[PDB]
Assembly symmetry: D2
Homo-oligomer: 264 residues x 4
């Protein structure tokens, strides 16, 4: 009776479906797959990437950056929503091949440094290559690259290091306030009395209110379905996108229903 | 045409076949599986573990340590042959549950710190949970635990951090010199002109001579077949075990044959 | 005109004045100096150390542990108030010589990992030897060693990783609730509009309320004067010690006065 | 009788004497101080810095890079001779302010990661802010930036991670082979029977032969006096510079004399 074999982290086929860059605003492009968000922001002094997707998406991200006229050495900074394998997957490889720096808060930094292993809820099941954070950022800290200011908003819950990123772009000269908010889901998490996260419920609740108050004209999420984006349809991709209030309210109704079933 | 799914590191069934502790010498026990070596050394001041096997072997190692009357908090030190997933697999988990320290040279430390990712030859294919080395040891340095002195002998090749560990035990009061030598194989490695390892051939050759000169009355290897051990047969397990000279000579004949075919 | 020389972190003479172990409760001893707290908790399964003081206090701590009959290999765990040089100074050296593990939250972990350098307020002026955290702990998480449960309470402010530690001891069989609360001072900090800490004032205020609600029969602080301890007088050391309310209220009155002068 | 105060690492005044960039070859400039080498290599794709000097030299290095028309974000890579405080001092700060990556071997990486603390010979006496290596390089590995190839040559001794860097530049179109060799000194080291470095003498001897065989038309050293440079005299700075043979032979005669006095 041999011990079990290791099990690969395997996701939906659409999470790994490459797509050509889809323009969000004047400087902002979606360059990930159909169902995983990877945002490229092009400035006069370099490029900023927010999330990278799965581990095996590293080559596709660089191919899309080339299509945008962004050489590898032009990627200055990597920002993250949270350091799970399906959002921070290729960060280690991207650092080696681009010379970019990574900016994260302490919680995302320690999780990223151990490649997602020893997860509070998933154990060692979703491990990925580790990377180091070069800059630690605090709640409300501004990160400026090429004139574009990125403000971090901590929203703990899905991970302790979960972070929303806001910045103002333009739509043909007219300013548009973009908010890239992290996941508000708890897929199979023990919510009440979790010895690895004793104040988990207080963090989620406080984060629901955080997402509501975000300065937002256009919302995006790591999983585009969470905010009702549809990257595959091109132009009408943002047609049915939720507001910040709708997104945090829908997430909280699922949180409470899950919290109530957990007591049952 | 979606990008490929991740692939799990899957090994032979016998590498994951648990076995009861097999006594090597008065203080030395094999507590791994049939085809993967994990050596436990019991002293008056604590226990020393050399290698741990696969990632999923952590529970079995602790079960065997209990059978030997070794509580988790009695494991003082973890030593490694090399930091590949099939030898350093459970080190991270074992540190959390035992309070042990890990001693390795700088090369094994940096590879262990990134969980085997970015391997010189295997890329990110054999990743495992990362761990940190608490003590860096130099070539020829002695590590003493409970009166038992462990001398490290660097033998780079299979990995840059590959290490042989020697110590003197007893066999009913009569001293027996044990040498635990690391792998001398190069499974699918590019040997000549490897941009990630330009002096690889000089390291292997120098390591063949290193293994020959080791003070050794009884030889063990991470893979027991390399030194012709057979853990499954219990008593006669060491019956056909190779000497140090036989082991390094057989490995070098395979190295040269492989080096010659590589030029062809 | 040569560039300036490096400047050593030099403290009051009394911060470096060794003292013999002073008993706080049945299992709890002060083993630091007259003006720097280092708490030793002796259990049936090992010892716990809370804070270590200055970098150069490592030998004195081990000398005092011996006086208590605690060998180096009996130190199981190191807990911290915050990772400044005058409280986490000897942690790196203590890990090497005792085999202890270190438990801290993510913020204290990242600061401890870079030896206090790049401090939010002090720059590189108070650097000390770096150490790694072996276990990351969350707010409200319980750490049990030898039956004694240690609960962490995050109180950000003096550092982002600032932590209060509570545990129940006994005083000749009668239980006594001990709270070791971290510093609530801001010596020379920019409080309002700090680009390295935009929500600093919200953290301090929330931490003042945290210290008030702590389950506490006897309060201790990293600097004993903050809670009106006097380690030098032996028996009457805790005679004039403040309550939790008195300590947080005195700290907040100094915070507000400082905040008001900062606007002036 | 209080414990001693901490002691600052204080060096000769000339080690901290700023100077204007001194041209070595077409692409290579000395931008450090009079007695500490910091080499800037300007390419079409960015800049390479070899060594940085003391911790407090970070601002001066950036001032000199500006004089050369090199903005902070143009610094692509930092290479090191060895990770002592007087050569790797400002590396941490330079990474934060330039976005450069650092390339070092495993030994220099682990020492740099702990800020020079726990030195094999100097203990914690010469600590500096820690930094992380982004790329691990092997002996003989080539690092190419902007067409300029940098080959590493390991020369252990002064530190285990000591490294010589060679590259071909031009002198008005005519190629000039530059070798930047690390220190070959052992100031106060225990040479024979050093428990922290049992094979120290074998490393130095092998390194003396390594420095002799280096492809070199013009030699430089971290301390310019070691190779008889005189940065202060401008034009005639390289007038009396030693060859590689003269440098390794003079170092070995001092090594043997020191080794012989150590036995006395
Ligand atoms: C780790 O990545 C997530 N989970 C998974 O991939 C798998 C899971 O947990 O099921 C999983 C976990 C552990 C394994 O060993 C294997 C698989 C996660 O973080 O929860 C990902 N991330 C998010 C998020 O970020 O919100 C959602 C959104 S919910 C959703 N998305 N599609 N359907 N649903 C209901 C869940 O999937
Ligand atoms: C990483 O672990 C080893 N390789 C493997 O497990 C697999 C491989 O390389 O084939 C592998 C590699 C990458 C993958 O993505 C998937 C699988 C390795 O380090 O080479 C292991 N370790 C040793 C050693 O330590 O010598 C031998 C001994 S040779 C031997 N053993 N049995 N048959 N043979 C001929 C090879 O297997
Ligand atoms: C870093 O350590 C503290 N500061 C200092 O040692 C020095 C300082 O800041 O002045 C300092 C700072 C930077 C330097 O380059 C040199 C020196 C600190 O963390 O603030 C220490 N810790 C606490 C605390 O933990 O609360 C108090 C309590 S206030 C107090 N204590 N005595 N008198 N006062 C008014 C201040 O001292
Ligand atoms: C750490 O930096 C070096 N040593 C020192 O700065 C001091 C020392 O050791 O004396 C020292 C050490 C520890 C302390 O707590 C305080 C000071 C070193 O690495 O040896 C530096 N580096 C080199 C080198 O790199 O070769 C030489 C060249 S020999 C030379 N240079 N000038 N005169 N001499 C004879 C020595 O100085
Ligand atoms: Zn997730
Ligand atoms: Zn996800
Ligand atoms: Zn291997
Ligand atoms: Zn193997
Ligand atoms: Zn402090
Ligand atoms: Zn303090
Ligand atoms: Zn040096
Ligand atoms: Zn030096």
């Amino acid at each position: 009776a041999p011990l079990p074999q290791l099990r690969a982290y395997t996701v939906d086929a659409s999470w790994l479906q490459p797509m050509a860059p889809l323009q969000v605003a004047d400087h902002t492009w979606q360059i990930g797959t159909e169902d995983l968000t990877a945002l490229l922001v092009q400035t006069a002094e370099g490029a900023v990437l927010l999330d990278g997707g799965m581990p095996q998406m590293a080559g596709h991200l660089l191919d899309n950056m080339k299509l945008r006229g962004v050489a590898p050495q032009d990627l200055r900074l990597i920002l993250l929503s949270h350091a799970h394998a399906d959002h921070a997957g290729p960060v280690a490889e991207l650092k080696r091949r681009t010379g970019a720096h990574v900016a994260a808060n302490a919680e995302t930094a320690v999780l990223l440094a151990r490649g997602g292993s020893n997860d509070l809820h998933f154990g060692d099941g979703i491990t990925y290559p580790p990377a180091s954070a070069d800059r630690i950022i605090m709640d409300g800290e501004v990160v400026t690259v090429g004139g574009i200011a990125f403000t971090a908003h901590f929203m703990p819950g899905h991970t302790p290091g979960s972070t929303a990123w806001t910045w103002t772009d333009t739509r043909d000269g007219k300013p548009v306030r973009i908010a890239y908010a992290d996941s508000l889901s708890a897929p199979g998490y023990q919510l009440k009395g979790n010895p690895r996260y004793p104040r988990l419920i207080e963090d989620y609740k406080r984060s629901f209110a955080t997402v509501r108050a975000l300065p937002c004209d256009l919302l995006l999420t790591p999983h585009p379905g969470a905010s009702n984006w549809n990257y595959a349809v091109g132009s009408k991709a943002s047609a049915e996108a939720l507001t910040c209030n709708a997104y945090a309210d829908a997430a909280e109704k699922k949180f409470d229903a899950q919290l109530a079933r957990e007591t049952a």
